[PDB]
Design a protein around this ligand. Structure first.
Ligand SMILES: C[S@@+](CC[C@H](N)C(=O)[O-])C[C@H]1O[C@@H](n2cnc3c(N)ncnc32)[C@H](O)[C@@H]1O
Length: 376
DNA sequence: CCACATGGCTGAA
DNA sequence: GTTCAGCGCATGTG
């Protein structure tokens, strides 16, 4: 009676999707399987392997000769020299393992109907808002569209992914983006999928973080008929609140910021349950100028900049949320963080970068909890 | 017009 | 090429 769930994660990062599925699997009588993934960012790949691998033993290796389109910064492709620098290192073994054991295809431009797995149960993806425009879609979405088009023609309808899940930032629903987002939804309809859009805040899913994200859950229309699946009203869900203090880690050796030069005010709580106070003459960048109270929720963790440097007031002084606490803030576990840290390949700022790019795990648990599969 | 709220990019080193 | 300290406005609601 156990159901094998084959998952394919496009733009996988550190695998919040895989983590969420593994977290709920027992309660659904599911066994989760990697069908494949697409992730080109070296430090995400390393971290994904660290978190999700079982009995992987890193060692110095030659980089597989076809691992050619990868990136050290997540934005730009690595040079021939950079590839040379990875070749014959422990790091190479992580990338080789992702290829061989997780079927990482690395670059979405290299995914086609000849290497895209058949019979995927859950396909996850995303795209930047620009991709809705010409420069008709572009970039990463054009590639997703191309792949769906290709497999539609070569696969039987039953071999196409049963569910699709997009995650995206809130501005996907802005005035300038929403109509063109709707045309993507039309396109998914043309591919044989019925979809529902959810705007969800992490704070309503057992987290101490204000983080509003857009999700488009799609189900293949014949599978909808077969299962009798109905979309759940997730935007009404409100779980009990959680405070920043609930995730903080005790230490005697934190670094505290010297804020003695800056004038401040009382804390104020906004409608969103964020409790903060400004620092005067600190910077000219508004989002850098706040200190957060640990008895409320915090701001959206970003990969870089002001919202990656989240100042909290504690009895011991004002400090940043640490990389460990940032993993906890995204609802990864302490053990997940320890595994990444133990690679000795990912800097503290890079850890925060990958955490900031991820998705709070319990939002995904809630979405995936609604999925229905036939006993076949 | 106002008050308020909220979340990556890049050039010097 | 990397790294991150320094830096502002876009996109809203009311
Ligand atoms: C915001 S993240 C997604 C993070 C992920 N949802 C997680 O659970 O951590 C977007 C990811 O897409 C990756 N990416 C960008 N361009 C890519 C490409 N051409 N091929 C594969 N991955 C790409 C980036 O490296 C980044 O990790």
């Amino acid at each position: 009676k156990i159901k094998v769930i084959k998952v394919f994660e496009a733009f996988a990062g550190i695998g919040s999707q895989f983590k969420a599925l593994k977290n709920i699997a027992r309660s659904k009588n599911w066994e989760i399987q990697h069908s494949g993934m697409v992730e080109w960012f070296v430090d995400a790949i390393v971290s994904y392997v660290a978190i999700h691998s079982k009995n992987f033993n890193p060692k110095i290796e030659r980089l597989d000769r076809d691992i050619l389109s990868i990136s050290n910064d997540s934005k730009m492709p690595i040079s021939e020299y950079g590839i040379k620098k990875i070749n014959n290192t422990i790091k190479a073994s992580y990338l080789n393992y992702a290829k061989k054991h997780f079927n990482n295809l690395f670059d979405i431009k290299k995914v086609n109907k000849d290497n895209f797995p058949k019979n995927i149960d859950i396909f996850t993806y995303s795209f930047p808002c620009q991709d809705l425009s010409v420069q008709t879609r572009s970039g990463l979405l054009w590639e997703i569209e191309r792949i769906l088009e290709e497999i539609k023609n070569s696969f039987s309808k039953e071999e196409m992914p049963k569910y699709l899940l997009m995650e995206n930032v809130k501005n996907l629903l802005s005035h300038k983006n929403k109509k063109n987002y709707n045309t993507w939804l039309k396109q998914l309809e043309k591919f044989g999928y019925k979809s529902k859009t959810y705007l969800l805040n992490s704070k309503n899913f057992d987290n101490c973080q204000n983080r509003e994200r857009v999700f488009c859950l799609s189900i293949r229309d014949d599978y909808l008929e077969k299962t009798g699946f109905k979309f759940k009203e997730l935007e009404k869900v409100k779980n009990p609140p959680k405070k920043i203090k609930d995730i903080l880690v005790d230490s005697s050796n934190y670094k505290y910021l010297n804020l003695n030069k800056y004038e401040t005010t009382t804390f104020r709580e906004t409608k969103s349950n964020i409790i903060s106070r400004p620092l005067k003459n600190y910077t000219t960048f508004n989002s850098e100028n706040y200190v957060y109270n640990i008895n409320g929720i915090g701001p959206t963790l970003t990969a870089s900049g002001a919202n990656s440097r989240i100042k909290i007031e504690t009895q011991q002084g004002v400090r940043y949320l640490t990389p460990l606490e940032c993993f906890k803030y995204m609802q990864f576990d302490v053990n997940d963080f320890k595994k990444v840290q133990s690679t000795n390949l990912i800097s503290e700022n890079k850890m925060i970068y990958i955490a900031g790019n991820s998705i709070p795990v319990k939002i995904l648990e809630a979405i995936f909890n609604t999925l229905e599969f036939v006993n076949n």
